[PDB]
Write a protein that binds this ligand. Sequence first.
Ligand SMILES: NS(=O)(=O)c1ccc(CNc2ncnc(NCc3ccccc3)c2[N+](=O)[O-])cc1
Ligand SMILES: [Zn+2]
Length: 257
Amino acid sequence: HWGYGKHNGPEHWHKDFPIAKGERQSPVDIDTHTAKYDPSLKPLSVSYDQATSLRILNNGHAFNVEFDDSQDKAVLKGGPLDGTYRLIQFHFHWGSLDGQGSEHTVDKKKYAAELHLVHWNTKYGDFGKAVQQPDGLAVLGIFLKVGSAKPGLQKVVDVLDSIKTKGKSADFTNFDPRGLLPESLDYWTYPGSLTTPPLLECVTWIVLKEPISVSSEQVLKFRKLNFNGEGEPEELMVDNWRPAQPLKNRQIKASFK
Ligand SMILES: NS(=O)(=O)c1ccc(CNc2ncnc(NCc3ccccc3)c2[N+](=O)[O-])cc1
Ligand SMILES: [Zn+2]
């Protein structure tokens, strides 16, 4: 039922999912002057050398690149986190135009897209149990701006025409997510939620300050995807982002400057 339109988009989600008006919803605007530098925050540890991608899937709301998360192979730790979080999938949110598409904003600036690398806390055993806990997930968010191509993105772009419509999937082995990371791991962090239903309040957000550049041709290929299934009226998969939500209590912390 839910999606991104006039009649089923973000402003409607609260009717099926009442936490949409909850106390720790994401995304949020990151006011860089109000974020508190915390000298006690550690460097983020991203250990993706043994990642095993398996598949790419059009789920009707974005595309997910899925990983084998049945062993510690691609993990996030350090930063603001206690313990170890396993990579389960990544996906993006993007716009119909280069001036919109990100979910988090920086001093109200929208980026063209935002990558989310989704990890679950191994103390809870599996993703499904982790999402039921306030420290269950750690999502690493990375902004995309349009400029030079990101060579490490091109394998993902080139398989999209094989998963054009909702419910399509393709083998996607040997993809290295290190090729999607900017040079700096400086970050902001705050407690929040999934940004799609069920909107569960289980996420430690870690949002990198430095964007990556992708080319106009690469983000063009994202916008050729479809929200509909095969044999249905074509709905381009664009503007699959939730807008910034009220911060309420919450303090955003910065690992730098
Ligand atoms: N946009 S956002 O805030 O980054 C974000 C929004 C929404 C989700 C929602 N993901 C999932 N929901 C159910 N099952 C899953 N997977 C299957 C599974 C279930 C139980 C145990 C193991 C695997 C996944 N999933 O794979 O991610 C994740 C991240
Ligand atoms: Zn996301």
